Amino acid sequence: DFILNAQVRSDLGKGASRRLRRNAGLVPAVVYGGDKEPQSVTLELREIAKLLENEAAFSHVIALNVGGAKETVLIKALQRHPAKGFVMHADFLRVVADHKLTAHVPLHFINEEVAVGVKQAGGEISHTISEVEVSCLPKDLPEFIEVDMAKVELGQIVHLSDLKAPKGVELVQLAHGNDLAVANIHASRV
Amino acid sequence: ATVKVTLVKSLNGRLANHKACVKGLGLRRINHTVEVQDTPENRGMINKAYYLLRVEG
Amino acid sequence: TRNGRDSESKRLGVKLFGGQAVKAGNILVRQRGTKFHAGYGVGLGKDHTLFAKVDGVVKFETKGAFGRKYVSIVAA
Amino acid sequence: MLQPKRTKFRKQMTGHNRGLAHRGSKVSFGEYALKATSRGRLTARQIESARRALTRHVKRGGKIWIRVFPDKPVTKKPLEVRMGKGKGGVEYWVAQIQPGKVLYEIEGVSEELAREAFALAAAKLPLATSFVKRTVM
RNA sequence: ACCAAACCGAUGCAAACUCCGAAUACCCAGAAGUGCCGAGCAUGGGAGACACACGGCGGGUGCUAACGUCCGUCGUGAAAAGGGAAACAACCCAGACCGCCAGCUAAGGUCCCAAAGUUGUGGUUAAGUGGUAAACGAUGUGGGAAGGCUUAGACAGCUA
RNA sequence: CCUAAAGAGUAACGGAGGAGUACGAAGGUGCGCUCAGACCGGUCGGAAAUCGGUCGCAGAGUAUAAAGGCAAAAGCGCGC
RNA sequence: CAACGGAUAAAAGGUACUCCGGGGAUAACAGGCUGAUACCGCCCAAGAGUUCAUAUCGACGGCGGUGUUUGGCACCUCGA
RNA sequence: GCUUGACGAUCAUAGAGCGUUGGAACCACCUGAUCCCUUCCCGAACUCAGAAGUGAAACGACGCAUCGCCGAUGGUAGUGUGGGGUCUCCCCAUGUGAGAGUAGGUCAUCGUCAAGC
Ligand SMILES: [Mg+2]
Ligand SMILES: [Mg+2]
Ligand SMILES: [Mg+2]
Ligand SMILES: [Mg+2]
Ligand SMILES: [Mg+2]
Ligand SMILES: [Mg+2]
Ligand SMILES: [Mg+2]
Ligand SMILES: [Mg+2]
Ligand SMILES: [Mg+2]
Ligand SMILES: [Mg+2]
Ligand SMILES: [Mg+2]
Ligand SMILES: [Mg+2]
Ligand SMILES: [Mg+2]
Ligand SMILES: [Mg+2]
Ligand SMILES: [Mg+2]
Ligand SMILES: [Mg+2]
Ligand SMILES: [Mg+2]
Numbered sequence: 001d002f003i004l005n006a007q008v009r010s011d012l013g014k015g016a017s018r019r020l021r022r023n024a025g026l027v028p029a030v031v032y033g034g035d036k037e038p039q040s041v042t043l044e045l046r047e048i049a050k051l052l053e054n055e056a057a058f059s060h061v062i063a064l065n066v067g068g069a070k071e072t073v074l075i076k077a078l079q080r081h082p083a084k085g086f087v088m089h090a091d092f093l094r095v096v097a098d099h100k101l102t103a104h105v106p107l108h109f110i111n112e113e114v115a116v117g118v119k120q121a122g123g124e125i126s127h128t129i130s131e132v133e134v135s136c137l138p139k140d141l142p143e144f145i146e147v148d149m150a151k152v153e154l155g156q157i158v159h160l161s162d163l164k165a166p167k168g169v170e171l172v173q174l175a176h177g178n179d180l181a182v183a184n185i186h187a188s189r190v
Numbered sequence: 191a192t193v194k195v196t197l198v199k200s201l202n203g204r205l206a207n208h209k210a211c212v213k214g215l216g217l218r219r220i221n222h223t224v225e226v227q228d229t230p231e232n233r234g235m236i237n238k239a240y241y242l243l244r245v246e247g
Numbered sequence: 248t249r250n251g252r253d254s255e256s257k258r259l260g261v262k263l264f265g266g267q268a269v270k271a272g273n274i275l276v277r278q279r280g281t282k283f284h285a286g287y288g289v290g291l292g293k294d295h296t297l298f299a300k301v302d303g304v305v306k307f308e309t310k311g312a313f314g315r316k317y318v319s320i321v322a323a
Numbered sequence: 324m325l326q327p328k329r330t331k332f333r334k335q336m337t338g339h340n341r342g343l344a345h346r347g348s349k350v351s352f353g354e355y356a357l358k359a360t361s362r363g364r365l366t367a368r369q370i371e372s373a374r375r376a377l378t379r380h381v382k383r384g385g386k387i388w389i390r391v392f393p394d395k396p397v398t399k400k401p402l403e404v405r406m407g408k409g410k411g412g413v414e415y416w417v418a419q420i421q422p423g424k425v426l427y428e429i430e431g432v433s434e435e436l437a438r439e440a441f442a443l444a445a446a447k448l449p450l451a452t453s454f455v456k457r458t459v460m
Numbered sequence: 461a462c463c464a465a466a467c468c469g470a471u472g473c474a475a476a477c478u479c480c481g482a483a484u485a486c487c488c489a490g491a492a493g494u495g496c497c498g499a500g501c502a503u504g505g506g507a508g509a510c511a512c513a514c515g516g517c518g519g520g521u522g523c524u525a526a527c528g529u530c531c532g533u534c535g536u537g538a539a540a541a542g543g544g545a546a547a548c549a550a551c552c553c554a555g556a557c558c559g560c561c562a563g564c565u566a567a568g569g570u571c572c573c574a575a576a577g578u579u580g581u582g583g584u585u586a587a588g589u590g591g592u593a594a595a596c597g598a599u600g601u602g603g604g605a606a607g608g609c610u611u612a613g614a615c616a617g618c619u620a
Numbered sequence: 621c622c623u624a625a626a627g628a629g630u631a632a633c634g635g636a637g638g639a640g641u642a643c644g645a646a647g648g649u650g651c652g653c654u655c656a657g658a659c660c661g662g663u664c665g666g667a668a669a670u671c672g673g674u675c676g677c678a679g680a681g682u683a684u685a686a687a688g689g690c691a692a693a694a695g696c697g698c699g700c
Numbered sequence: 701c702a703a704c705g706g707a708u709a710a711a712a713g714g715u716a717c718u719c720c721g722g723g724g725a726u727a728a729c730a731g732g733c734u735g736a737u738a739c740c741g742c743c744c745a746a747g748a749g750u751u752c753a754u755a756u757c758g759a760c761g762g763c764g765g766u767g768u769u770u771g772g773c774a775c776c777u778c779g780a
Numbered sequence: 781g782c783u784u785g786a787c788g789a790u791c792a793u794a795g796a797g798c799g800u801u802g803g804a805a806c807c808a809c810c811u812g813a814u815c816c817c818u819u820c821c822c823g824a825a826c827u828c829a830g831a832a833g834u835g836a837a838a839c840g841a842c843g844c845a846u847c848g849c850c851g852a853u854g855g856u857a858g859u860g861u862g863g864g865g866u867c868u869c870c871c872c873a874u875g876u877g878a879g880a881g882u883a884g885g886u887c888a889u890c891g892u893c894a895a896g897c
């Protein structure tokens with residue numbers, strides 16, 4: 001499931017880190033956060049690359065296992081090769097039972113076939129954004145935020161305030177007094 | 191507290207900074223071995239010309 | 248072409264660095280404007296030149312509001 | 324042909340093209356993209372040529388973004404002219420491309436149709452390319 | 461119903477943009493040792509030279525063309541022989557006081573021309589690739605991580 | 621000013637601009653004061669004149685190009 | 701005295717009638733390096749071909765080869 | 781030990797905003813323009829003589845992270861020296877190592893003198 005294995009990294013630097021990717025086939029990583037000193041760990045590339053095609057990979061909670069001591073983490077940021085695209089570095093944020101945390105949550109758009117602006121007016125659908133910054137307690141962190149586009153007419157805009165959210169979830173950008181277009185309907189290009 | 195240093199590569203065409211590092215330890219022609227103290231000032235002239243010397247410890 | 252012009256270089260910059268001993272009348276920095284301001288023991292020429300007025304050692308401190316960079320002379 | 328409406332200076336030095344593209348290498352607007360895997364420079368007539376070939380194939384809906392803008396002037400000295408006597412006039416405009424830069428984006432089409440159209444465009448460009456989907460990060 | 465400053469967010473570029481910002485290099489001071497017995501400075505006798513070349517690195521110009529041209533900084537030639545790169549000033553190794561029918565090595569090499577392993581261990585290539593060259597194309601071949609069907613009969617063939 | 625490679629210097633029939641002046645106060649000193657701009661209200665002027673208020677902090681200004689400076693303002697006014 | 705370290709207070713042209721001293725330190729011919737240009741191949745396929753992209757052509761774009769035209773450079777030859 | 785006033789150190793982890801509060805003393809607004817003095821007009825500002833009112837404005841203190849400002853660990857880019865490749869560009873050994881971003885932090889900390897408890 002959401003299981004990752006790690007070993008304690010000891011050699012730090014550019015030359016040491018370039019050697020892991022070339023010979024050992026491992027990936028440097030960091031486990032910071034919580035109330036502890038940060039820990040530098042390493043993990044195998046073919047295992048992190050297999051957890052990353054799960055759709056709810058970043059918005060779920062991982063069970064990291066460093067050596068024989070396991071704990072609760074979350075994919076906080078990720079580094080990829082600009083050209084090839086594989087992952088080079090990754091950092092994990094520790095999860096505390098009573099502490100607010102932030103995450104990136106993808107949006108599950110639904111029932112676009114029977115939208116009023118598409119079935120009747122013959123318009124298109126454009127997803128302006130595909131994830132939203134959220135902030136919530138770990139116990140109620142959603143896998144996806146569901147946006148419903150059934151009763152949408154041609155030219156009608158959908159903003160952050162339009163979509164619903166589960167309990168105890170803030171949209172961060174909305175809290176900053178900045179709601180922005182999520183999706184819209186418009187006439188065909190040609 | 192002392193280290194052997196042997197010059198094993200030619201001084202021809204080396205940077206003038208590296209030539210004066212070898213001359214600063216007392217090495218003059220190839221396959222010459224000298225007795226120098228293991229002091230931080232001397233230890234830093236060896237590292238600047240690592241590729242030219244053979245250090246026997 | 249209508250471009251081939253330039254002017255002689257003026258040799259500007261710092262002449263004495265931090266820690267150097269100074270004498271009275273010694274020129275410290277040559278400037279256009281004031282990148283550096285005259286601190287304790289230093290004077291300002293009419294073309295914005297910093298010169299020593301006492302004997303000592305260059306300091307090169309930045310302090311005060313406005314984030315100014317000061318050149319001062321201290322005890323040796 | 325894309326080119327700036329006005330420029331501060333008419334000419335530029337040749338410069339050098341170095342480094343990977345850590346900025347401009349993410350699928351930001353669209354949902355499928357054509358990334359560059361080799362470095363070079365597009366001459367603003369290939370950017371224009373490769374855009375006919377991409378919108379013509381979809382020919383039904385879809386939104387297309389162009390993430391490359393040619394903003395660097397280049398000069399050519401005329402024929403039968405000696406060396407020196409100034410710098411040549413501006414002929415065309417190019418864009419510096421580094422490995423990893425995303426060139427074209429598209430959405431509102433099937434994944435299979437995106438692959439066809441981006442192969443039409445890539446044949447008009449003088450550098451290696453790739454097909455990239457979109458990720459959360 | 462077109463255009464639309466202004467603002468909010470997302471997203472690129474700059475030798476003559478900068479909220480930032482190195483490694484080196486440069487200036488100064490205190491210290492051990494080395495210096496061919498001196499290196500530094502000053503004052504005098506005598507000069508030659510002020511037509512440079514290529515290679516590496518950082519740039520302008522040219523077409524990021526030229527054994528092109530113009531700068532900065534190193535190395536060699538000039539003024540440097542010897543061994544290697546077949547032959548080959550400027551590349552690699554190394555700096556010739558003289559003699560020896562003595563030994564050890566550098567770069568480069570060890571089937572024959574032609575001195576020295578037809579040495580040992582595990583793979584790859586079938587193209588004389590090695591021993592010249594791109595976009596692009598192809599059931600050539602070795603290794604790896606995974607997938608979709610499958611004795612409820614999978615994929616090719618054949619009878620409705 | 622850039623080339624010019626974060627000390628100085630550094631070439632091309634390389635890329636861009638200026639000068640061959642002005643001022644008896646546009647100098648000295650003492651004292652005093654902050655600009656451009658936006659919005660609102662106001663007789664004709666109306667996007668733009670003079671006036672009142674709020675915001676703003678230098679996006680103004682410097683005899684003259686560009687760069688570097690400018691709150692003890694180096695910007696503005698008055699007396700001697 | 702701007703030709704701005706200013707030859708004098710005071711100064712323009714022709715030579716195919718020409719002449720001397722030199723230079724491949726520097727051009728015209730041919731050789732060499734390069735290949736912008738030139739010529740010859742190939743990749744993509746909007747299209748023309750009654751329908752049908754490739755019988756025959758092929759836009760907008762891209763990749764090469766040969767030294768083969770117009771050039772670039774000035775390495776050899778000005779005691780031919 | 782506490783409050784108020786004056787002068788400094790340091791220049792945002794110290795600022796901006798948004799709320800609460802202080803008049804016994806201090807400070808401020810305040811009363812008037814005969815005198816000193818002032819306005820390119822005007823007691824608005826400067827100045828003088830004060831003691832009827834109010835802490836409304838201003839100032840000070842106290843709270844909050846909303847903006848701002850600080851900001852790690854790790855990774856990445858660049859880079860001196862030596863050596864390589866398919867040499868417009870990169871790679872290896874070794875030393876060095878940002879900018880942006882992430883977790884987070886901040887509603888300052890001191891010194892001298894004079895008044896009142
Ligand atoms: Mg390294
Ligand atoms: Mg060498
Ligand atoms: Mg110029
Ligand atoms: Mg010029
Ligand atoms: Mg110059
Ligand atoms: Mg200059
Ligand atoms: Mg003075
Ligand atoms: Mg150039
Ligand atoms: Mg960039
Ligand atoms: Mg720059
Ligand atoms: Mg500028
Ligand atoms: Mg001697
Ligand atoms: Mg002499
Ligand atoms: Mg002499
Ligand atoms: Mg001389
Ligand atoms: Mg010369
Ligand atoms: Mg010359």
Ligand SMILES: [Mg+2]
Nearest residue numbers: 512513530531
């Ligand atoms: Mg030279």
Ligand SMILES: [Mg+2]
Nearest residue numbers: 512513514529
């Ligand atoms: Mg040369």
Ligand SMILES: [Mg+2]
Nearest residue numbers: 516517518519
């Ligand atoms: Mg070069």
Ligand SMILES: [Mg+2]
Nearest residue numbers: 519520521524
């Ligand atoms: Mg060049």
Ligand SMILES: [Mg+2]
Nearest residue numbers: 337338339524
């Ligand atoms: Mg270039």
Ligand SMILES: [Mg+2]
Nearest residue numbers: 513527528529
């Ligand atoms: Mg040359």
Ligand SMILES: [Mg+2]
Nearest residue numbers: 526527528529
């Ligand atoms: Mg060259």
Ligand SMILES: [Mg+2]
Nearest residue numbers: 202203536540
């Ligand atoms: Mg020599």
Ligand SMILES: [Mg+2]
Nearest residue numbers: 511512538539
């Ligand atoms: Mg000579």
Ligand SMILES: [Mg+2]
Nearest residue numbers: 540541542549
């Ligand atoms: Mg030789």
Ligand SMILES: [Mg+2]
Nearest residue numbers: 542543544548
């Ligand atoms: Mg030889």
Ligand SMILES: [Mg+2]
Nearest residue numbers: 545546547548
């Ligand atoms: Mg050869």
Ligand SMILES: [Mg+2]
Nearest residue numbers: 543544546547
């Ligand atoms: Mg030989």
Ligand SMILES: [Mg+2]
Nearest residue numbers: 563564565576
């Ligand atoms: Mg031997």
Ligand SMILES: [Mg+2]
Nearest residue numbers: 566567568569
């Ligand atoms: Mg060997």
Ligand SMILES: [Mg+2]
Nearest residue numbers: 546572573574
């Ligand atoms: Mg023979």
